[PDB]
Design a binder for this molecule. Sequence first.
Ligand SMILES: *[C@@H]1O[C@H](CO)[C@@H](O[C@@H]2O[C@H](CO)[C@@H](O)[C@H](O)[C@H]2NC(C)=O)[C@H](O)[C@H]1NC(C)=O
Ligand SMILES: *[C@@H]1O[C@H](CO)[C@@H](O)[C@H](O)[C@H]1NC(C)=O
Ligand SMILES: *[C@@H]1O[C@H](CO)[C@@H](O)[C@H](O)[C@H]1NC(C)=O
Ligand SMILES: *[C@@H]1O[C@H](CO)[C@@H](O)[C@H](O)[C@H]1NC(C)=O
Ligand SMILES: *[C@@H]1O[C@H](CO)[C@@H](O)[C@H](O)[C@H]1NC(C)=O
Ligand SMILES: *[C@@H]1O[C@H](CO)[C@@H](O)[C@H](O)[C@H]1NC(C)=O
Ligand SMILES: *[C@@H]1O[C@H](CO)[C@@H](O)[C@H](O)[C@H]1NC(C)=O
Ligand SMILES: [Zn+2]
Lengths: 596, 195
Amino acid sequence: STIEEQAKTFLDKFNHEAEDLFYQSSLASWNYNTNITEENVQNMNNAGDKWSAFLKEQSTLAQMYPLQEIQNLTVKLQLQALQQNGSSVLSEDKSKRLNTILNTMSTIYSTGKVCNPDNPQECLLLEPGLNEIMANSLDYNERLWAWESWRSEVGKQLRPLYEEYVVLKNEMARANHYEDYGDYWRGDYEVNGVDGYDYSRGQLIEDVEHTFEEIKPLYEHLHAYVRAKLMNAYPSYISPIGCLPAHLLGDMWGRFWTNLYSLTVPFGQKPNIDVTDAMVDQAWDAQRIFKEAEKFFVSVGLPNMTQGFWENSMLTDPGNVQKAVCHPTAWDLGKGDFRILMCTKVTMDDFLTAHHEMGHIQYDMAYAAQPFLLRNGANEGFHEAVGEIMSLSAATPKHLKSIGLLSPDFQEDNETEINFLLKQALTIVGTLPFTYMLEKWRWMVFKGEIPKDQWMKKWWEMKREIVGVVEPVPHDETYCDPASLFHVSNDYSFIRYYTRTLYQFQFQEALCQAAKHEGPLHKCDISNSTEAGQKLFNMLRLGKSEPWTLALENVVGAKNMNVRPLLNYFEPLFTWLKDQNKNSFVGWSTDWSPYA
Amino acid sequence: TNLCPFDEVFNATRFASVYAWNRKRISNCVADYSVLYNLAPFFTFKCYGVSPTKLNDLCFTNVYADSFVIRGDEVRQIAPGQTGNIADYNYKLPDDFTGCVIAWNSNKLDSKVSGNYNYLYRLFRKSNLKPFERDISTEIYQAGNKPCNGVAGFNCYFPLRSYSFRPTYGVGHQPYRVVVLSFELLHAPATVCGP
Ligand SMILES: *[C@@H]1O[C@H](CO)[C@@H](O[C@@H]2O[C@H](CO)[C@@H](O)[C@H](O)[C@H]2NC(C)=O)[C@H](O)[C@H]1NC(C)=O
Ligand SMILES: *[C@@H]1O[C@H](CO)[C@@H](O)[C@H](O)[C@H]1NC(C)=O
Ligand SMILES: *[C@@H]1O[C@H](CO)[C@@H](O)[C@H](O)[C@H]1NC(C)=O
Ligand SMILES: *[C@@H]1O[C@H](CO)[C@@H](O)[C@H](O)[C@H]1NC(C)=O
Ligand SMILES: *[C@@H]1O[C@H](CO)[C@@H](O)[C@H](O)[C@H]1NC(C)=O
Ligand SMILES: *[C@@H]1O[C@H](CO)[C@@H](O)[C@H](O)[C@H]1NC(C)=O
Ligand SMILES: *[C@@H]1O[C@H](CO)[C@@H](O)[C@H](O)[C@H]1NC(C)=O
Ligand SMILES: [Zn+2]
């Protein structure tokens, strides 16, 4: 017998055993998350340890099959996903050192206390203490004090830990046949062995910069408008050509700009679409909301939901003694077990969150027939984008009027569309330059092009040229400003938030093309469009079996990430911003600073 | 009025594994197929060769009842001309099969919170099964070129695995009880029809 038959048999065995063990571990984790007790903690720890030991043993056993002699490109993918030598390559001492370092990072970030001056007792955490301050308080002094205190108290402790983390991660990347840790991160999108669909790790940087170059004018026009509004709000703190201050961006780090909406609304006399009172009048509850979501998903041809979903999932907060984490998640325990963990309230935000996690569950149910190692999204961006498109479609006034939530006498006027587009742009458009800047800075840091002593020296030129943000207080090498973010401190890749943004708009225009929508794209709806449902399902059912380029081409006809649909989405908003800013300076200067 | 027991077949307190399916011979009978719809919505009742529509008025030499338990996904594999693990390594039906297949859900009985490991199935074999053949041998399968020597190791796997049923599984992973009735006509008095 050849090696391929041996690999197939071993993969069958691994599929069976891994399916059983993963189901057990996921069930234990769900019982912990829905019921916070110490016995649940110990059960989850035992299950996780058993699953990790099994995975490591099977990876070591699968390492004995060299990759080259396996054809069919499907067994090879599973073998590649299984081998994954990982951090075990280095010495055990270095492995435990990295485990300890990451544990200290997580502990420091989770237990970061900021104490107000003159009283070392009124100390606050990220949530809900400083989050409320940075999201609701409009005081210049308080925001500046919180910004400085967090960047001074937390980053400085993490700086040497971050340096050791970077060095040893570079060691692992070099030990795993990669150029740097950035190359290891970019290896997710790599495709090999398929003609006409090959993707290189270096192509991602070119694609990202090419797309951002085209995105730049719209973000620049939005930045000018936000600068004018902040000037109307803070006449004494922003220069006519200088950049925006760091602590006037609506939140702690400037990642999202939604918090300025109440400050930057162009037409405040027209209320937005809020149907929470409508659901209150009809006494809507959580189960009614989920039934409506299931009806919406069935209307496009997608199947029913399993009875176990209704029996087992916890759709309401239990209150009383039973404590649980109210973070909305979708759980795929395996073996036909799908659940949703959500503390549902009577709110339109929860109404959209229901559709979001319902789309997650539908995507999970789509590829349940794939082998165990191929049950994921084609890459790290399709899964959340498929989740997001259903929430985008369900929020249109047409869909709200179709279910009786909105009164039929509601006539849309372009003021409402302008307000809605500005609200959407304050969240979607604003985060793209930040994501690109952070990813590029981390890539340069890992690559070694940025010298150690000139980390921060470099870090603040991009903020002025890419995102156009100038610091209020200069920071030397002692501070560690980037580590104040949850993602980098917990060692998570950050580019998945970029490509997803450019995916959820490529799908929609294609999906709306199947529904024969006429008019603006931002007022589209994919309901009652079984053709669009089939078109989407043909991609959802693939899983990880096929390259992500082929999966993307299956729906949009293109093998590469494209930004034209995103710009087409905001075209009326782009024209409105051009008209409004024709009488204002466009651009910014990188030399002015609020601290002079 | 000699009515032989289909109650000892359909209402058995415990069934057999698919790889060790139970075969029972039934003869000298008053065969009453008319009253069999006394199970919890039995999903599958399909007959091949003989019409289910009140064609019980025909006298057969002997009847075989074969009983086992599988999961919901492989119920389709109990049919002539099918391919799969169950159809190839565990239980094979002939291409010209005549008889009936009755399959009904058994989640309320065969499922346990901590897992039901009693039921087993065969995962590896050298060659497919001939029709109506049974294999019970537990000799470990050899995938490589080196002798196994009766010890599990590299390229030497135990051929039998377990379903491990639970009540929270999906419909396609829930236990199903299957009974296959096979009819013969031979050169004999053929004394099993019953009014
Ligand atoms: C999607 O289709 C459903 C059913 O075809 C629509 O629901 C009906 O819409 C009509 C339109 O006025 C109402 O008169 C009915 O009372 C609705 N319910 C029924 C027929 O059970 C739904 O409006 C459609 N939605 C969209 C966005 O096209
Ligand atoms: C949650 O856990 C407590 C103690 O472990 C137990 O008494 C209670 O029944 C559990 N709740 C549910 C819904 O299982
Ligand atoms: C690849 O292997 C699968 C079994 O895992 C098989 O169904 C498929 O036909 C094979 N493809 C080719 C091209 O041999
Ligand atoms: C780690 O695994 C890879 C893939 O099997 C292998 O090429 C490499 O030699 C392994 N390294 C060590 C130290 O075992
Ligand atoms: C399940 O979906 C089908 C269409 O696929 C629909 O006819 C049926 O009503 C749905 N089930 C329920 C309980 O509504
Ligand atoms: C809305 O349309 C009317 C009609 O042409 C126009 O006068 C008005 O300026 C438009 N509003 C905006 C914000 O463009
Ligand atoms: C099994 O027992 C029930 C009552 O206990 C009876 O109604 C049913 O007919 C029995 N099954 C058969 C095949 O006779
Ligand atoms: Zn989500």
